[PDB]
Amino acid sequence: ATQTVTLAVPGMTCAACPITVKKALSKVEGVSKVDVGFEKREAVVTFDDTKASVQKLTKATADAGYPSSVKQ
C-alpha cells in the first residue's frame, strides 16, 4: 500500500548523513509528502508504491550512505 507514516532515518549523530535520508524518501519513487531531518534522526514522509515501494526508497537510501526505515 502507499507509504504515509513515520520513517526511521539512520545517521542520527552522522556529520549530516540523515540530512540526505530526508530527501532520499521524497527523492526516490512513490514520493508524495515529506518530513525528515538529520537535526536528530527522524524520517517522516508519505510516499507510495503507486510507482515505487518501501524497500525501493529505503534501498536507494541505504545505497547512498544515508538510509531509512518504517516507523509509526
From Swiss-Prot:
Binding site for Hg(2+): C14, C17
A single GO molecular function term of this UniProt record: mercury ion binding
Superkingdom, natural source: Bacteria
Parent sequence residues shown: 20 to 91 of 91
Biological role: Involved in mercury resistance. Acts as a mercury scavenger that specifically binds to a mercuric ion in the periplasm and probably passes it to the cytoplasmic mercuric reductase MerA via the mercuric transport protein MerT.
Keywords: Mercuric resistance, Mercury, Metal-binding, Periplasm, Plasmid, Signal, Transposable element
A single Gene Ontology CC term: periplasmic space
HMA domain span: 3-69
Description of how the protein assembles with itself and partners: Monomer.
Compartment(s) where it occurs, according to its Swiss-Prot or TrEMBL record: Periplasm
Organism placement in taxonomy: Bacteria, Pseudomonadati, Pseudomonadota, Gammaproteobacteria, Enterobacterales
Phenotypic consequence of gene deletion: Mutation decreases resistance to mercury.
Similarity remark: Belongs to the MerP family.
Protein name, per record: Mercuric transport protein periplasmic component
